Amino acid sequence: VLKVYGPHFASPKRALVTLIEKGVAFETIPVDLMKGEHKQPAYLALQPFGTVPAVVDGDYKIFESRAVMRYVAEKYRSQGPDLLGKTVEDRGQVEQWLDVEATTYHPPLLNLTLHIMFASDEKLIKESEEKLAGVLDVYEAHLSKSKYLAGDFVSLADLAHLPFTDYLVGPIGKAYMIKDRKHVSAWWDDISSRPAWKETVAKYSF
Amino acid sequence: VLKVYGPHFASPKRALVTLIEKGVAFETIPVDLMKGEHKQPAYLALQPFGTVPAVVDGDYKIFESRAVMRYVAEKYRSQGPDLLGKTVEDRGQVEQWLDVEATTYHPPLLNLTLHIDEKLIKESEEKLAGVLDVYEAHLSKSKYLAGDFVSLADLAHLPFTDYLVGPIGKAYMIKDRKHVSAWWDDISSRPAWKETVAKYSF
Ligand SMILES: N[C@@H](CCC(=O)N[C@@H](CS(=O)(=O)O)C(=O)NCC(=O)O)C(=O)O
Ligand SMILES: N[C@@H](CCC(=O)N[C@@H](CS(=O)(=O)O)C(=O)NCC(=O)O)C(=O)O
Ligand SMILES: [Cl-]
Ligand SMILES: [Cl-]
């Protein structure tokens, strides 16, 4: 059975929500980051960068949360929603917005997340919020003409935004970044209410 | 008919080398970044984030350099080498290291590329060095990043690492790590990369 390491943290929930969306059986294994368990040789053999998640599926091992999403969505492509889309063109749009999350949306969000948890670099915080807001403005324009990021179907690209945006509008206290943008807000309301996400949060929150 | 915008810049070279490896016909279109053309309405209609590359393939439009690599590699899968691997598990490993490149390798390297801030530079180098130590242990056991076959994961490292070992003056980060060095020598001497560089250097 597929095993996911570090379910209580945010990046692993990208994989968990995908697993739950595809109806794939899995177990989770905690990793004690606060006591540095992830920097010890045992976990480093699973994830050489010492970060979570790592996934072991029998003899097969894979890390990087969005790679795991792609692996699960391709391996179990025929069951559940097709989170990769149907055509090569569809998958292209999915890969596109997934990389937008990885390279453009997530990094400034992570900086706000970390540096507001540090109360810190107040210049970095101001820059990170503005960069993120700039990204959300693009999303806003895009989502006003497209139901989901990759098209008229929900995909890995959308699911990838769930764990850290949830943090953003919750304990970080910046719900206005989502709320003040009408189309983004409706999109967020839609994907964050999907049963797979509700189950992920109910089961694996701090 | 497939068109690539901004060939003289580094990220677009991830797409170009993939296009050349796969034997795909394409045209290129310059984008004048220094005059701010990429921030004007015309290019923004192609890439709403105002960065290069953007790709237009007939009526189909796609951006993000690594997404373009994936799209090309899948659409033209049967021709040239299979840069996605053969199985679902192979592709998983390719996606894994492609994301390591996007999220772990490239961000500190990009800081070096841009700023060459004193502290940011020192920190980016240390961070990139730590990343390269992991590459070194891994490549001592695996011929390429994703396994015993060359893939998109390897190719994605070509454009900015070319900067690193050249104009940046930090070839030692690659050279001092035996397995990384041999791996780099290998992928950067592939004819598709030589052609990319020969044709599209700024
Ligand atoms: N690109 C990696 C990043 C994973 C990552 O950084 N995880 C964090 C935890 S969290 O951001 O997802 O909550 C971590 O392990 N931090 C440990 C450390 O850096 O020491 C992925 O997405 O899998
Ligand atoms: N995530 C994007 C990043 C694209 C990007 O930032 N391109 C740079 C050019 S380069 O880094 O590849 O040389 C750019 O357009 N910079 C212009 C700007 O942001 O104003 C991708 O990989 O396609
Ligand atoms: Cl955990
Ligand atoms: Cl150009």
Swiss-Prot record, chain A:
Domain GST C-terminal: 87-206
Keywords (A to Z) from UniProt: Cytoplasm, Detoxification, Oxidation, Oxidoreductase, Peroxidase, Phosphoprotein, Stress response, Transferase
tRNA processing among keywords: no
Any one Gene Ontology cellular component term annotated for this protein: plasmodesma
Pfam families reported in the protein's UniProt record: GST_C (PF00043), GST_N (PF02798)
Regulation: Redox-regulated enzyme; in oxidative stress conditions methionine oxidation ensure a thermodynamic and structural compensatory mechanism to guarantee H(2)O(2) peroxidase activity despite transferase activity inhibition.
Keyword Transferase: yes
Post-translational modification Methionine sulfoxide, affected residues: M34, M117, M177
UniProt name for this protein: Glutathione S-transferase F9
Classification lineage: Eukaryota, Viridiplantae, Streptophyta, Embryophyta, Tracheophyta
Swiss-Prot record, chain B:
InterPro entries cross-referenced by the UniProt entry: Glutathione-S-Trfase_C-like, Glutathione-S-Trfase_C_sf, Glutathione_S-Trfase, Glutathione_S-Trfase_N, GST_C, GST_Phi_C, Thioredoxin-like_sf
List of residues binding glutathione: A10, S11, H38, K39, T51, V52, E64, S65
Residues modified as Methionine sulfoxide: M34, M173
GO molecular function: copper ion binding; glutathione binding; glutathione peroxidase activity; glutathione transferase activity; salicylic acid binding
UniProt keyword list: Cytoplasm, Detoxification, Oxidation, Oxidoreductase, Peroxidase, Phosphoprotein, Stress response, Transferase
Enzyme Commission number(s) from the entry: 2.5.1.18
Enzyme class: transferase
Database matches in Pfam families: GST_C, GST_N
Cellular localisation: Cytoplasm, Cytosol
Induction comment: By zinc in roots and benoxacor.
GST C-terminal domain location: 87-202
GO cellular component: apoplast; chloroplast; chloroplast stroma; cytoplasm; cytosol; peroxisome; plant-type vacuole; plasma membrane
Catalytically driven reaction(s): RX + glutathione = an S-substituted glutathione + a halide anion + H(+)
Domain (GST N-terminal) ranges: 1-80
Family named by the database record: Belongs to the GST superfamily. Phi family.
Name this protein carries in UniProt: Glutathione S-transferase F9
Organism whose genome encodes this protein: Arabidopsis thaliana
Gene name, Swiss-Prot/TrEMBL: GSTF9
